[PDB]
Amino acid sequence: LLDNLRDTVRKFLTGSSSYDKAVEDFIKELQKSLISADVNVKLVFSLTNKIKERLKNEKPPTYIERREWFIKIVYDELSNLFGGDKEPKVIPDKIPYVIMLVGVQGTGKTTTAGKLAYFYKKKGFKVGLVGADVYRPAALEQLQQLGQQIGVPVYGEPGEKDVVGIAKRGVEKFLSEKMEIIIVDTAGRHGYGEEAALLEEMKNIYEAIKPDEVTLVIDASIGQKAYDLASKFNQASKIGTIIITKMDGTAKGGGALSAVAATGATIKFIGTGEKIDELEVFNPRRFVARLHHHH
């Protein structure tokens, strides 16, 4: 969406027609591209109405061209659509720090667990990974391969299906090894649409491990349908954050980000590609800044 918004911006700034038609043309194209990105239509309409209103109340500061000022207001409001200017807290100040990853099946989460452990190893922490995703049988082997490849130890119990016992033995072992960051990879038996049961089901793992942070991993190709789960996830704990993965393998990452941001939850990271280091700290203002036409 942003790379497509770049070209629309360019067409708007290299001053073709009247201003008002240039603006009209741009808003239609924005509305169209956001619909295509699966953003909820009510957010698409509010966004453009808010843009149009700022433009009627806020003349450009002196020295600022009108078209430049229009674009500044569009960029500020795209950022607000994805959650607004905010820089999450990504380095823990309590050690040890236990992070429980949760989510529906297939959210780029075992990869996400290795990517998170890599991020924190690079930061100089001592991390241990707990492979408690026991529905998928491949998840553990996959985790053990990541760990081995990135030099972080992986606790896992081949063929075991008590996720609560695995998470509790793995955390206790890592806490005894005096690990500083402990990442517990868990999935869930439900999909999107079955949010109450998904959440209920996270409860006994959580109580067992008493993590410092619970992180819901969302695949971005769910789009705007991430809303319900994210909303209920976020209300259910004071320590919940969200990771949106696979932003590069969908057209619907704007729908997913905008739908999560509508809940107010914290999107701490986004997963961009499949490579181990492609996990980035997320700030809507920076995310939007990437396409700025003055660079």
Is residue 110 part of an annotated ligand binding site? Answer: yes
38 annotated to a ligand binding site: no
- The annotation status of 162 as a binding-site residue, yes or no, is no
**Residue 270 main-chain phi, psi, to 5 deg:** -125, 145
Is 187 labelled as part of a ligand binding site?
yes
Rounded Cα distance, 206 and 100, in Å: 8
Q: Is 228 annotated as contributing to ligand binding?
A: no
Which fold would CATH assign to domain 1-87?
Answer: Four Helix Bundle (Hemerythrin (Met), subunit A) (1.20.120)
CB count in 10 Å sphere of residue 15: 12
C-alpha 36/C-alpha 197 separation (Å) is: 30
Q: How far apart are the first and last CA of the chain?
A: 18
- Side-by-side strand order, sheet with 127-131: 154-155, 127-131, 181-185, 97-102, 213-219, 240-245, 267-271, 279-281
Q: Is 246 annotated as a binding residue?
A: yes
103 is in an annotated binding site: yes
Q: Is 263 annotated as a binding residue?
A: no
| 154 annotated ligand binder | no
Does the annotation place 107 within a ligand binding site? Answer: yes
Query: What residues contact residue 238 under an 8 Å CB cut-off, 6+ apart?
Result: none
Count the alpha carbons within 13 Å of 163 in the hemisphere toward its beta carbon.
Answer: 25
Task: Tell whether 188 is in a known binding site.
Answer: yes
* Residue 145 counted as an annotated binding residue: no
**Residue 109 marked in a binding site:** yes
Calculate the alpha carbon distances from 251 to 1, 3, 4, 36, 281 in Å. 7, 11, 11, 7, 21
Q: Do domains 1-87 and 88-281 have the same CATH topology?
A: no
Return the CATH class of domain 88-281. Answer: alpha beta
ω into 61 cis (within 30 of 0): no
What are the beta bridge partners of residue 271?
Answer: 279
- Give the 3-state secondary structure of residue 61: coil
159 is in an annotated binding site: no
Task: Return the domain boundaries, the chain.
Answer: 1-87, 88-281
108 in a known ligand binding site: yes
106: left (phi over 0), alpha (psi -120 to 50) or beta: left
Pair of tokens at residue 230: 């994210």
Q: Where are the beta strands (DSSP E) in the chain?
A: 97-102, 127-131, 154-155, 181-185, 213-219, 240-245, 267-271, 279-281
